[PDB]
């Protein structure tokens, strides 16, 4: 089942650019048609009325399904919370993309001040730069500063339009905390590239629909409610979104040692 | 560094390996899987696979998985252990929710507990008619004890023959299920009214002739049901042990005019000798080629499975199961005999009373030897239970008829302190660890309890 | 205890802390889209496993139900013991006024042994059936021990050996056979018919009628 | 709706209904409720008690 | 791959019940007289 | 009795009151075979080192294993014989590799070994560890020298005895 998702805008595109980030509620595929001919509130029988209230309340959602983020609708996301929560979620995201999408469809970049936390990513072929070769194979697309962008190939695009497909969809991850992003990153972003701001800063947090905030120690993400189908924001108030599928460094490394075995 | 040699097992194969004992399991599981797959493919065995979604894991043979972040060491894997390799199926799914309280109650109960069923109902009926017929037989025995009427013996005989024919018809017709224990319960239930029917035919006042006749015929029937059925043989082993001792006492009271104390001390001697002989006797009785009916453990192995090949496995297992059941029945019967003889000896209003209390203590230690020595949980627990019951029986035999606060306070104090010491020996003592030398010294002490019984047996005999 | 056997489900609801919904009497607002969020169970090892999500506060219903069951089983056991003890109060032989407590015992036997149909958990049902037969056993043993009549002895051993045997035959026959809806209906009604006399007969045992007849 | 606030008789029967339905869900593990023997036998109890009361009154009239 | 389908289900209409009007005062007087 | 198993070697077995099997091995070898009395699942009754010679220097392991102490292991396996055959192949493969080689005996060669052990008397020794290489020295036409290992507790305890002619 690995790397089986497809570029083309039909079919798999419903799940090509989307990533499981956690678990949480969603609206069912059954749609509750209105209980027409409701009696007036003095005539309303207590038991059946209350039972129907409870049915509408609780059958409103399916509990503990995978919660998804679409990479195609926000120019970036910014991750606010405790460091290991944020990192664990980031490793989970990276491994989800690495399993689901091949290296020819999604390429990955990590920009960091602490490369020891990111030493596991070297095994993942998606971090391999096809352009530079070394003894170990393809060059790892991990940089220690935003100034260390010697690519300039992901930075000649225009501003980004949210999808409603680029050849690789670059995912650039930053926990460098550098003011220099706002030069190469406008208010709208870059075309084929989505970003993930670790260590949430006022530069990246300028859009609450992009901020995934760990509100509870277990990794409860709050963000804005989005439509199950279009991934578009439905209303502006921040609310419970998911509990994050946080993953340890050892599991990530183990998966990376698995993924390194393959070259197709 | 330390590396543990262990066995590992998967895919109906066991392999032995040496694992880097202090590296996390998450470091080693993946190439261990590759190793196992290579070895199985070399054997022509279908290799392991991931089915759907889930993850590979290692377990102890008891079933508990190992923490992947932990090494072998700190989760107490040692050299010579066995590990079981699995792909654990994905546990997560949507949580259901039933918003209405009444429906949620009904569905949770129905899902999680077991209803009454006719399979259970027939067993319940058999149990209750067994209890009823033992009450009726014991009641007729009470009446013949109280009154000299010959007429109870026809009633006991007729109820015995009816229930025995019913049991035989059920065992013959309905042998096809493991619910033939209904017939076994009825047969166990119906041998008793036969015993009291034969016993009540002895004329004159009730006593030793009635006792020896009833126990002899009941033990004889319990011996026959071994060769004709061979099912549920622990209880019949205990019963034939009790009937052997009771018949030996009845013949000693008819052929001779021996006192009760002499016979009880003989019975105690026979008990401690038989305790010494019981495992060997069990290993003998293990091979009497009685019918082959698999008990529960053997049945539930033979469902998972099809002097060479599997027929040897089947025979070895059945033979061991018979052995363990015979041994357990024997120990229960001896336990009953031991407590009943010690209770019969320790009359408080006797001049020799200090001596049988010593016999009690010596037997108590001797039993605790076997309790620490014998492997089966329910045999060690049998031995411990009877050992305690010695003390309880002699204590009450004093304090009930000896109307003094002194003996009362002594009994009740030892009756609460002594089992608390028995608990203390495992509760506070770290995992019941003592040195092998100290263990062997305790074994010496409780062995040195035995040879004082021999002259005391002579002295209480005369 | 006869009353309490009918209260035992309601009391076992009430003690388990199940509470039935409040009612919106006067508030006149029926739509609430509050969508209660997941309680989240942290993995007991704390060992970096992701936490798991349970559906709502309503997840405690799964605990409360199992508690209610345990209460109900306790109630039926206790009431069993009490009714057997109370029906041990039949000491004298049946000549005189003493067939009335024997008749009362027979009625409460029939009532319990039919009552067992209503309880589906095997240990509640078995608890009622064992209670029912234990009534008959205790009454019979007290007649044969207190009275020295051999006829009483013969009747006691006869009922002890036949009645549970009849129960065994009923257990073997009944779940396999079909039955007529009429027979099923009278096997309902025999419950109520054997239940109803027990209070009048009880007042006969207290001689409430005679005291009120003359006080 | 906390406290000792007033309640209508239609709520009294509505609660008693939910109590019976929960009792049936507790003793049996079905909630199909088209017939219910619980009511029938508590009516039999009521018949027993009312018969004892009636006979007690019939005893009072003697002097 | 698995299957999923949308559905639309109208919820049933709750019961209706006329609120009791309450007995007039003279009825209570009559009741007390009858018992008297 | 005999078997060839899903393993690697043919293995002879004898039974009378429990199972017996023997392995030949070809200066001193390691003494640490006491651990193989307690394999990963099976529990063997004893490990006996056996040796015989003058010339005709022969050296043997004979193993005793009670199935009834091992039922929990046998029940997992398709035969009791296959169980002990595997456990002896384990010991053979553990000994094999050095200058000394090892294999299970065929039961025919087991009767040959019994004949050569008979070929047609001093005290059992309390302290033995140094004795072995000099206890061969007394003049005889035939010597049989053997050492026994038994599971007295979680350790393993040792006894040795000899006879001449």
Author numbering:
A (entry chain K): 145 to 308, 318 to 417
B (entry chain N): 18 to 323, 339 to 494
C (entry chain L): 288 to 502
D (entry chain J): 12 to 74
E (entry chain K): 13 to 48
F (entry chain M): 95 to 120, 140 to 167, 194 to 259, 288 to 332
What did the publication describing this PDB structure actually write?
The ESX-5 T7SS is found almost exclusively in slow growing, pathogenic mycobacteria and plays a key role in nutrient uptake and immune modulation during an infection.
We observed that the EccC5 TMH1 of each protomer interacts with the EccB5 TMH of the neighboring protomer via hydrophobic interactions and is further stabilized by the EccC5 TMH2. The TMHs of EccC5 from each of the six protomers, most notably the TMH2 of one EccC5 subunit that forms a domain swapping interaction with TMH1 of the neighboring subunit, contribute to the formation of this central pore. In contrast to most other TMHs of the complex, the density of TMH2 is less well defined, which implies that this helix is more flexible and adopts a range of orientations, as indicated by our calculated ensemble model.
